[PDB]
Amino acid sequence: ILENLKDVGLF
Amino acid sequence: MNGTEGPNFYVPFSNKTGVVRSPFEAPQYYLAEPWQFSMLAAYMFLLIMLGFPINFLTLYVTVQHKKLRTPLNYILLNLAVADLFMVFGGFTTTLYTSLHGYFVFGPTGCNLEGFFATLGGEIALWSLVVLAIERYVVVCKPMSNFRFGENHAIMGVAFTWVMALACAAPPLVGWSRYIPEGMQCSCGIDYYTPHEETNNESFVIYMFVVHFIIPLIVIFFCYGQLVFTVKEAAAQQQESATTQKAEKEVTRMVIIMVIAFLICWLPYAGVAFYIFTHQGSDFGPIFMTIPAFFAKTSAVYNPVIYIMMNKQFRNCMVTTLCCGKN
Numbered sequence: 001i002l003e004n005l006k007d008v009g010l011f
Numbered sequence: 012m013n014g015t016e017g018p019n020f021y022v023p024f025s026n027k028t029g030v031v032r033s034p035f036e037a038p039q040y041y042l043a044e045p046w047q048f049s050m051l052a053a054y055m056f057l058l059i060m061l062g063f064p065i066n067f068l069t070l071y072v073t074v075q076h077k078k079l080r081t082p083l084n085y086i087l088l089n090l091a092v093a094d095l096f097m098v099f100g101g102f103t104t105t106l107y108t109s110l111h112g113y114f115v116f117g118p119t120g121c122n123l124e125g126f127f128a129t130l131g132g133e134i135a136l137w138s139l140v141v142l143a144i145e146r147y148v149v150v151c152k153p154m155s156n157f158r159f160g161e162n163h164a165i166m167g168v169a170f171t172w173v174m175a176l177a178c179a180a181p182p183l184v185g186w187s188r189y190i191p192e193g194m195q196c197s198c199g200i201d202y203y204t205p206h207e208e209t210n211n212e213s214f215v216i217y218m219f220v221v222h223f224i225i226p227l228i229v230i231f232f233c234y235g236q237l238v239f240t241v242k243e244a245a246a247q248q249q250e251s252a253t254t255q256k257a258e259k260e261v262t263r264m265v266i267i268m269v270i271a272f273l274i275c276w277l278p279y280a281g282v283a284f285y286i287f288t289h290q291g292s293d294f295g296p297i298f299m300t301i302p303a304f305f306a307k308t309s310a311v312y313n314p315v316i317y318i319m320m321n322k323q324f325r326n327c328m329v330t331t332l333c334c335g336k337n
């Protein structure tokens with residue numbers, strides 16, 4: 001999820 | 012009788028003393044002290060001095076930084092543009108009109124101002140809805156083998172524009188109307204006077220359900236699942252301190268974004284719904300501006316939450332603001 005979380009700017 | 016009807020307005024002040032004037036023609040210094048008008052002007056001035064840089068710098072750094080120009084950021088730019096509509100449509104105008112004491116631009120200006128201010132705030136509103144959707148899709152992955160790209164992203168931005176026009180245009184063509192509001196210096200949707208010639212009762216519910224309830228639910232579902240998807244993936248990965256931080260940092264942001272959304276639009280909902288339930292009672296001018304105070308400031312705190320707490324937008328902004336360094 002981390003890579004998907006950085007793509008959305010939430011982490 | 013707590014008001015004063017006219018052809019294209021409603022002054023919330025009894026004309027039993029013969030003092031009420033059309034908010035297009037003469038200052039409404041009888042429903043508010045002239046300093047209360049100055050304080051209104053002061054506040055409008057503030058939202059310009061903060062809203063314009065923040066939302067403009069958001070547009071500016073995206074021009075200077077290749078890495079900001081990603082499809083998942085398009086909706087964020089759309090947001091900054093929506094706020095700019097809120098700034099130059101509503102804030103600048105209301106600053107000028109507040110200094111005269113009445114909406115000097117006549118009913119025509121009342122429709123222009125009301126349209127672009129309504130358009131700005133709803134593009135921003137649905138922008139938050141679209142962004143919440145995108146993040147649910149990207150993170151929670153409900154559709155196997157799906158990939159979010161530039162094509163899907165442009166659809167998202169256009170969707171906000173259709174939804175926003177779906178709310179800002181009907182009052183121009185008879186399903187509601189823009190009239191002077193509160194202290195009569197700004198123009199908005201007539202949600203508080205039954206006007207069967209325009210079927211306000213229907214439009215308010217259309218607004219309340221379509222524009223309010225639907226986003227409230229989408230944003231609650233989309234972000235509900237997201238925290239869940241992130242909570243679960245953290246439990247299965249407790250050996251990763253980073254994955255544990257992300258879960259906490261994401262939970263925090265989801266709470267902030269949700270809460271901020273409520274502060275922005277719950278007041279408006281609560282007031283309009285009250286007037287719908289408790290029809291046409293004595294609602295003061297300043298009473299009407301308290302809902303209006305919260306969503307207008309969103310033109311500042313939405314860019315702060317969504318742009319300035321985004322780790323990259325922040326760094327690109329800092330580098331840009333420090334002449335290319337750091």
Ligand SMILES: *[C@@H]1O[C@H](CO)[C@@H](O[C@@H]2O[C@H](CO)[C@@H](O[C@@H]3O[C@H](CO)[C@@H](O)[C@H](O[C@H]4O[C@H](CO)[C@@H](O)[C@H](O)[C@@H]4O)[C@@H]3O)[C@H](O)[C@H]2NC(C)=O)[C@H](O)[C@H]1NC(C)=O
Nearest residue numbers: 015016017018020022025026027028029030031032033034
């Ligand atoms: C709030 O209430 C006030 C008072 O009720 C109201 O203001 C009043 O508006 C009327 C117009 O509807 C004004 O009446 C005018 O008075 C002048 C002189 O006093 C007349 O000349 C006007 O025209 C008459 O005479 C003309 C002759 O040439 C005729 O052609 C014409 O048809 C008229 O017969 C007219 O009588 C009145 O002066 C004001 N009162 C005050 C105190 O200003 C106001 O409109 C209300 N507000 C709202 C939003 O409704």
Ligand SMILES: OC[C@H]1O[C@H](O[C@H]2O[C@H](CO)[C@@H](O)[C@H](O)[C@H]2O)[C@H](O)[C@@H](O)[C@@H]1O
Nearest residue numbers: 073074076077078079080081082085161
């Ligand atoms: O022109 C050079 C840059 O092209 C791209 O920048 C654009 O990417 C999209 C089209 O390819 C546009 O929709 C978007 O608005 C721009 O960011 C590329 O991404 C840049 O790295 C290039 O420098």
Ligand SMILES: CCCCCCCCO[C@@H]1O[C@H](CO)[C@@H](O)[C@H](O)[C@H]1O
Nearest residue numbers: 037038106107108109110111112113
């Ligand atoms: C950028 C800010 C511009 C402020 C322009 C204020 C123009 C005020 O103009 C004045 O408005 C008064 C009522 O307030 C009227 O009584 C005066 O007749 C009118 O000259």
Ligand SMILES: CCCCCCCCO[C@@H]1O[C@H](CO)[C@@H](O)[C@H](O)[C@H]1O
Nearest residue numbers: 128129132199200218219279280283
């Ligand atoms: C629950 C909401 C009921 C629909 C009517 C409320 C709309 C408030 O007003 C309208 O919406 C905009 C939102 O920014 C306001 O800021 C604008 O002044 C106006 O266009």
Ligand SMILES: CCCCCCCCO[C@@H]1O[C@H](CO)[C@@H](O)[C@H](O)[C@H]1O
Nearest residue numbers: 231234235238258259262265266269
């Ligand atoms: C609609 C989106 C709102 C989701 C907010 C969920 C916040 C719950 O709190 C979360 O759960 C933990 C308990 O397991 C808490 O201890 C932590 O603060 C947090 O991780």
